[PDB]
Amino acid sequence: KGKMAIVISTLNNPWFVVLAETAKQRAEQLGYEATIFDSQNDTAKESAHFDAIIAAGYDAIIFNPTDADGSIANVKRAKEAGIPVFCVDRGINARGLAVAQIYSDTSTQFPKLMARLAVEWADQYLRG
Amino acid sequence: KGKMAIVISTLNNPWFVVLAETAKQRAEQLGYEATIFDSQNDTAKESAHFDAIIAAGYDAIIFNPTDADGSIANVKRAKEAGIPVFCVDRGINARGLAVAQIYSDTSTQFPKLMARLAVEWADQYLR
């Protein structure tokens, strides 16, 4: 129980709509309240969103960043407020391979959690 | 059911031993057969592991890479063979902070599964 903030870089691109909407739905299925914050590819809007999320005292943040400067600053602010952040994105490697990524500074000491998540992801993929 | 390959960069460090053991246990709990391949910090052995995994027809790969550049080529070969890869690792970011990473060649077009996993990570962290 608690509330999770879903911060998405945009909602005019389908990949991000699916990401934001599915994350909200899964949080609600697990017993959380969840709200989507749309940064609209704007640094100031993303920063304003973190202002409200920190003020509201959300329990966790699912964060799709708009860049690699103001966004890491916003993550730092959430950490100082004691709010864990789990970042989600997709990118293209130097050789062209596209990869979808989840990362977080919270769980580096928890190999059991990371192993279970990776296997559960593979399981959901294979069974569908 | 199915069969997953667990490719670990080394079995000479506790974090990686626990990672590999837990991945094998979780795969079995979820109804899969699982096999561990120890790369022993050797890109040649990692590549040879992917050689045998592709030939054996594994259904999924849980991948802890030895290197950043050379190991991405193994993710390509698996994708070329139609085997989905789910990578788990830890790195040091540009600000010098340790970061835990889970990533895949899947969910780059329809990220429903990755979205759910990110929320489950947060939930398990909170509980």
Numbering used by the authors:
A (entry chain C): 1 to 128
B (entry chain A): 1 to 127
Q: Could you pull the original sentences from the published paper?
A:
Periplasmic binding proteins (PBPs) are a class of proteins that participate in the cellular transport of various ligands.
This corresponds to a dimeric conformation, as it is about double the expected monomeric MW of 14.9 kDa. The crystal structure of RBP-CPN was solved in the monoclinic space group P21 at 1.79 Å resolution. The asymmetric unit is composed of four chains, of which two pairs form a dimer via a segment swap. The novel antiparallel stretch of the dimer-swapped β-sheets has not been observed before in proteins with the type I PBP-like fold, and the existence of this swap highlights the flexibility of this structural element.
